[PDB]
Design a protein around this ligand. Structure first.
Ligand code: ZN
Ligand code: ZN
Ligand code: ZN
Ligand code: ZN
Lengths: 303, 302, 305, 302
């Protein structure tokens, strides 16, 4: 039986006797916070730990709060260099609740980490009998146990009675096939998100600029459009070094280049299918290699 | 045939079959892209509709898709006209191949002309579907089918100029609301902050220092808040700023008694209202009251 | 606390099993029949509607535990035939009760929460699954294994349930329960209505087999907008002119089969099913056939219920 | 510019901008509405494409939407041309307002003319989306957005004439299948039966008595069968009829080790293939073997 390390970032999500049949599980408490307080330090802590301990286990499961699991999933998808499977898992209902989803979520997550088929597929989020790539996976509902989906290109496979049927694999480069390497970073570049809406104030953007933020993600309207005020600030900020990425508050679909913004004229980067919090993850990492907008755009076209 | 007024806010989205279903008169109220939509367009639109209500049998409003869902909820809360008021746009240029503009406008005029459309609140008509202004949101960046009522579904479908209504909104709207923008020249200042991992409290701090009357939080999950943002909004609520917890999550309610103690902090949960929607209601509420319980009552009724 | 009856048609998706039940209602369980919902049939339907209608004044609301496979069929039948305006709520489990993270227990709690809520009255028969309150007419099973499978795929849910409280925001427009003229109280049998599938090169033999057996009605799971393959059309067009009511529905999972489509329904006396999928079309067709054989009346019924 | 051949199987769905992306030659193979699609059109199409393969750089097949998902998967299993072959249709009449056909065709020609589109099997391009011929199904009755890959999602999206491909299907297709129809005049006879409450066994018994080679069951839930239909189909299996359990449920798989002991009765489970798609593979499998276990392996692979 394979040896699987369980990395915990909060409390239990489940106690699950059926684990014995699949793997020799070992547990470690890495940090203990709710996922709404996730932060850079924990991301570095996690990636370094998976990367260093990679030869010591047959694979990792990370228990994590569902609220920002999509962010941590994508961060590890760009920075883990361990070829073995790294699977993330949460629960939408308390462990003590009726019909708690945790126990079977943790079981199915271990099934995935123990399956040789899951290697070289990137960081995975396993939820509601579904194997999801860390890039496209997002939380779509505030309460539904089925909440995690890949709303653009879909899941990688499904789990029925302990066996995964794999039928898709993502084209974007992940994990050991990416240039990012955080093993020697104690700090990620400062990147913030600003929302767009009718009559949107430019003060949130002006504040991140006056703080010297390395980059700013715009949660645009429609295909990455910006409210006039916010537009002007970010355009000024771009001309003085600040990287700005046009994402969208719209939950599915890409923010494309050659849309309604002349990104070349202003030095802006389009985020494609990466939603704002995910666009932030790539921009942070991108800023560890380059400040140049055309090169940041190439990166957003590749990862 | 019914008389329908079209009020254009753009932006052209040429359709001769209109004259088969209605007598059409057009007016240009303003001329902007909807990404620059703002409080004054909203006030002009509401007052134009209310003032001209009895001069016509229904309204169609052509409008950029980007903020259509915002304008629709506002009109739905402030229009005092019990004739149909139907919003419509296009996802493709009118000059584009297979432009949705023509048929979208045709179906919009059908809906405004259907007497079964009255008393349904302000409507959005896109991709052969009638959608209530409260739940309707733009779910995709480029798809013609982008507009969906992602929590409670559409009100009706249009086929060959016929609407089969099978649903009606339970929330009170239009003339059943206490908001009367008739004598207003500006709306309470309300901004939106995003939550995410490591989120800076600077964007919230800036709105506070500017004396904003309300802040809506695009929270994570069931309206949860990153620590920095939580600390600043909690202070803001104690020194008079109204704060509403919504969620960046595209579907589902931010519920009271969730993971946050709204009574303790003086917060209001938005329910199924997404952040830009919850901003609309919070503005109009801040014209009636500043007390968190009354605003919450409002967010429970409209 | 409200008195709520649980009527079982199969048995245990999870009262000692779910103790929290005690906090919301006074529950009592009756075992009406014991079959798997894939073998559901007319006799069970007649028994349930008769049972619920007779016992209506002896309780404050019914919950029916049911197999998921045909939950959506029984719900619409009860929706058309129950005259008890008290909450009638169906519930199932996509996961075995002995299984890890079984959905049964919380499904049953939420179903009782719905049956006990005074606001659930006058909504017709409900299906309560995955924290969602769905009307018996539009609800359908969308996925073969997901605990989230039950969705109202055309007009959406009626309300959602969070921490034992329901937020209703919608109510179905089609007449149901006591607003219908269907009365099964004295019926021992239902008109014979079968379903045939359309697909490329489809054989007309299934259709001919129902016609040769004197079937009262045939529902076609057509392609696209209730369209019919050549042979099936030829057969069902003649079936109609002979007195066989035929309803054009569609295999397509969402959307209406519309009148005034590619099919001249008036010419052949076809009826368009609207948003009713084939198995739901059959329900209404059967009931329609207890009142009329006339196509124009049947089309009206399909436009009203 | 690439040479692209458009093969028509029915009327027109509409385009001068084609000239800017490809050299377009058109052939009219048949002319039927796709609801009358049949084994013959399918054989004509496969042979057409396998024979003209070196005569062009890509194929576009204009086709009615009704049975588009069936022809798509048949060609996906039988075409040996590894050049792109893209199928396209329209949900709106070419003469109608906002007809989707023109742009549909434009994007189908873009997809075929893209070198990235090669070696992906047969593709269906509708509503700016590139879908694989196995998983694409028609999900709505009238919506232009109707075609979706309901189990695994699309392969790419089309924006301003460029495809962002981000997925490719696992199952072997085209030249990687053992199916060969170059010399076949007819295909094995497979019917489809529906499951529902109180379901009559008469449809299944008609197919048996005609000595059908195969029967696909549109089952309930996880491929389950009504008592009557079970009995008949268990009987037909023993006497040599290949039966496949599919499901009327529009999403998810019919799995082995479900509520049916498939080995005991000689039944085949169809996985994520819906009934009409199960028929495609069951027919083709029947050109290679009649044995229940061998037919199951084929359903696990293609
Ligand atoms: Zn990935
Ligand atoms: Zn409203
Ligand atoms: Zn009903
Ligand atoms: Zn394929």
């Amino acid at each position: 039986l394979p040896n699987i390390t369980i990395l915990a970032t909060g409390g239990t999500i489940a106690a699950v006797p059926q684990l014995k049949d699949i793997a020799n599980v070992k547990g470690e408490q890495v940090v203990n916070i709710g996922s709404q307080d996730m932060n850079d330090n924990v991301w570095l802590t996690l990636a370094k730990k998976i990367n260093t301990d990679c030869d010591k286990t047959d694979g990792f499961v990370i228990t994590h709060g569902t609220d920002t699991m999509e962010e941590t999933a994508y961060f590890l998808d760009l920075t883990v260099k361990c070829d073995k499977p790294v699977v993330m898992v949460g629960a939408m209902r308390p462990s003590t609740s009726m019909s708690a989803d945790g126990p079977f979520n943790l079981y199915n997550a271990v099934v995935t980490a123990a399956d040789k088929a899951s290697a070289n597929r990137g960081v995975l989020v396993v939820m509601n009998d579904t194997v999801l790539d860390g890039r496209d996976v997002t939380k779509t509902n505030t309460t539904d146990v089925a909440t995690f989906k890949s709303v653009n290109y879909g899941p990688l496979g499904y789990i029925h009675n302990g066996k995964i049927d794999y039928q898709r694999t993502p084209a974007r480069k992940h994990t050991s096939d990416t240039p990012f390497d955080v093993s020697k970073l104690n700090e990620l570049p400062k990147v913030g998100i600003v929302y767009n809406y009718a009559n949107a104030s430019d003060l949130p953007a002006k504040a991140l600029v006056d703080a010297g933020y390395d980059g700013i993600v715009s949660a645009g309207v429609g295909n990455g459009n910006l409210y006039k005020s916010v537009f002007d600030t970010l355009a000024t900020a771009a001309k003085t070094g600040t990287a700005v990425v046009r994402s969208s508050r719209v939950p599915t679909g890409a923010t494309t280049q050659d849309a309604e913004v002349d990104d070349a004229k202003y030095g802006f980067v389009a985020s494609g299918t990466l939603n704002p919090q995910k666009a932030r993850v790539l921009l942070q990492l991108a800023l560890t290699q380059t400040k140049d907008p055309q090169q940041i755009q190439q990166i957003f076209n590749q990862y």
